[PDB]
Symmetry: none
Subunit: 220 residues, 6 copies
């Protein structure tokens, strides 16, 4: 990634072997949890496109998901190249050329060019754009990987309300929806697909009640 | 997180994977207990709000408590923006914007803004307030996760006194009761809900019995 | 813990994750033994009172021993406040106030107070006093945690002599007493509860002999 | 590996034991996987040829693959020496001699020679050439180690479609071919060896459709 | 232990918890091999007597060996007090007092006195003498631990010569003898208790032969 | 061992327990293989002779190889003191004594003398010579530990070719044969001691077969 030395100039540090060891390990160990995506955001803070590509390719298995995310990367690069024109000519000092889709993807770029593009003034967030594309691809793969839909979860006769709401939130984290409508599901379906006793309890308590008090009422 | 060098000037540092690996493991290994709050408070000392958000997002399971702490953060931010109004419209040159309800948590604020806020002169303890809010949320959570109340704790006919008093102090530590009422009840409810023979022995020993005397007498 | 080193002494670093993780893991695995006393003393060499509080709060389980340690610390703090009264009236400017009985435990004090009290000229060893308090508490804990007394140790017909004396010395170390009677009790109890073969061997050797000759005598 | 940093660049540090241990573990545990080439490229980022030799010598087992790698490296070094002949006669003073074909592999060179070659002005990237040789050898190794060809892959009546396409893409990644034939062969081979139900589904969808719709079509 | 900072003055650094963790784990896991004492020498390089005392006390179990080493320490301290007189009077700056056996052992001394004694000119190797006493005690313990004597090992009819000589040297590392006589032992007992066929082979080859050629002849 | 600081001046550092534990695990884990000599050469790079002595003394088991390496060290020291006579009797002021046969290994020499020798101007590579001697000793050890000669390798009727060629190259690398004779025999013994059907198939290809062809043709 990129680090700043104590009272020194901006220098580029190599990839973290211990972090990569953890990243490969986490996927195998954790299977494919939704929390894995944040994991990538925390482990790849300020990482270069080459480091991101190495971290993606070093993963063993999930080749179908890798092909899907590569297709999404190609589509995003094509959209970027279509929305932003490309100009050619002499390169003036202090100003870099127009990055293309393949240059943002990092497949036809080099480490020195990436450093020059990320250390310019103003900086070009090529790494940030690639990381956003990667996390969007991971969100798509975790949406497709969801075994149970958001509208298919219902509280059973013997299933506790704690486990019910836990699974409901786990499916909501993996479902596809916008941020505004995201509250509508957890406000309506959470009480519309519960056990009838706690349904009546929450209806008598009030719909505007919060999760803590509604659970303390459903537990008692 | 934040480290202090021998020179005197501090810089930003990315989140180390070892701390989060331990944090994910400690939450899973220890489940939920009173000891998790201190570990959390000692492990995330001097960290940016984004690091705490990632730690609260990288946890696997128990999404109910995560939603509880998220709603607690939202309520605290609402109370903060209600009690602290923005009376100053324009911003002086060289000064950064005041942290609002959504900026104090790091939802719509980048890491550079948090760095500039925490490194100001004088510094703005946004991370400290966020840690206090998370500690209050965890207190509420461990109070909800109590298996039973303090009044229902009664020693059985053949159950030993060691595990009995252990469970008693365990369910008393997670209680939101004040120090005064806890010190008042620990002198009465411990002897009133004990083994009859031991209870009579402790009552005949005197009204100034301490912990070690009770442990030595109740086991004989 | 506080760090006294080269220029730049005005530094304070929190507890390292490796230390705290190791202490919680070792205490649970080793349960309670006389051995923990030196491990705790070595892990907390020159630590701040808040660090000791965090280390005492990180332990999970055994709430009775923790309550006994807390009440012993409170009693010793009350004794210290009784023997070292605080002076009334206004304090002199530039002179730090002496630590009170409750300030040693770190319950009503802050970080800057203990930092100024430890880095004062001359320094005030409040951390050493708190460590001695915790050591006395752990001594009382390991004394009350003794399952079998020292007099109920008798070697069986098939139990080895080495294992017998190992158990005997472990039980003797678990209990705290004056060494002047220990020198007599070890000699008047070791050579009395051995096997008949080892008993006649030590009788033919001599009571005033050393221990290594007794170990190498009845071996095998 | 080479360390290019602030003043004091003239420094050579050996390979860290942790990275070498991680390499040994990932070689022993996973044998050879299509993802080992990015692992080697990340763990050996900017290393001296001696470091590459030490990493290639610590491999456990699979002597045939190592011999294949060695002979490929020798052949490519011979080709480099043939295409880049060395100039005869005396060398100019102060100008470092060009590395020979055998000097790149580090079989007849020393540490100071390659240090001066990599730190010259302009630098000579012999380490990158050796890494290219090693990754080409690894590609040949993973192509030879292919247990089943790409045409002998047929999905059974009960095997899932996701695992089938995962195995297919894994076998395709294990083999190295031109980019202009792979996009045609995958489309002409995937929609033929699927389940009858999934075959009818994809026939109802369309040949020129994307892969995500094929994955989400016959799911469950 | 004692360390020297880069371009700094000689300062005493605190003890490392990981060292004690490795030390407690290795002794329990490896029981009492002769190499354990050597391991001790590497872990206690330049450590203060308090560090060695804590390391010995933190060991779980084996209180008999602890009592034996404490008795040896007391005997060595008494011998040092008898051979070196003790003087009293005013302490001049720059010169330390006469170290007593109780001060060499470190049971009745503090940290600052030992620091001043080890950082004086000329330095008084109190820690080195204590470490020598401790390794002598460990040698005595590992000699007592030896189940089979050096003269009781004989090669069986089906036992190979490799394991035979391995066990022979393992027992020789645990017997009580000086190096001058240890050479004669490892020269004559190796051929006196060997296999008769290999005995005749070595007699035909020659007694002055080294172990390598003797083993290569006995294998064939 | 020996580390290089950013300033430029190097200092002495004690052996880290992690490297010693890793070496012990590798020795315990893999017994003896031709691949452990590069592991030792890369793990103990730039270490004092005392560190190598401690590493060779802390190993548990296989004392025959330890005695072999000790005898080789003694023989090399004898050859050194025989070929390098001490012609200079007096020692110049400021100059250290010349390392003798017993001083080059560290038996009767302290660590300070070794530090002064390795930090001289010009430095005396005593550690490098000791490492070369240990490498030669380990070479002799792995040559002796060869199960059989190179001629006894014969592929059976049902034994596969992969494990056959793997064992062949293993015992060839463990052999003391020179680089020329190894390349001379690897073209003959591999084809003359194979499965008859495969043997004839490979002989029908020609005298210019490569390793990949031998692997792909024999398996058909």
């Amino acid at each position: 990634p990129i680090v700043q030395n104590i009272q020194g100039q901006m220098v580029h540090q190599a990839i973290s072997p211990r972090t990569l060891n953890a990243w490969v390990k986490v996927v195998e160990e954790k299977a494919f949890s939704p929390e894995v995506i944040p994991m990538f955001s925390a482990l790849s803070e300020g990482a270069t496109p080459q480091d991101l590509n190495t971290m993606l390719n070093t993963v063993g298995g999930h080749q179908a998901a890798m092909q899907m995310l590569k297709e999404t990367i190609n589509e995003e690069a094509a959209e970027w190249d279509r929305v932003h024109p490309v100009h050619a000519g002499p390169i003036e000092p202090g100003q870099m050329r127009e990055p293309r889709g393949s240059d943002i993807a990092g497949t036809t770029s080099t480490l020195q060019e990436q450093i020059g593009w990320m250390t310019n003034n103003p900086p070009i967030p090529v790494g940030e754009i690639y990381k956003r594309w990667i996390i969007l691809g991971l969100n798509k793969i975790v949406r497709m990987y969801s075994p149970t839909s958001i509208l298919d979860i219902r509280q059973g006769p013997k299933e506790p309300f704690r486990d019910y709401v836990d699974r409901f939130y786990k499916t909501l984290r993996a479902e596809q929806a916008s941020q505004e409508v995201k509250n509508w599901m957890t406000e309506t379906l959470l009480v519309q697909n519960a056990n009838p006793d706690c349904k009546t309890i929450l209806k008598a308590l009030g719909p505007a009640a919060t999760l803590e008090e509604m659970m303390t009422a459903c537990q008692g």
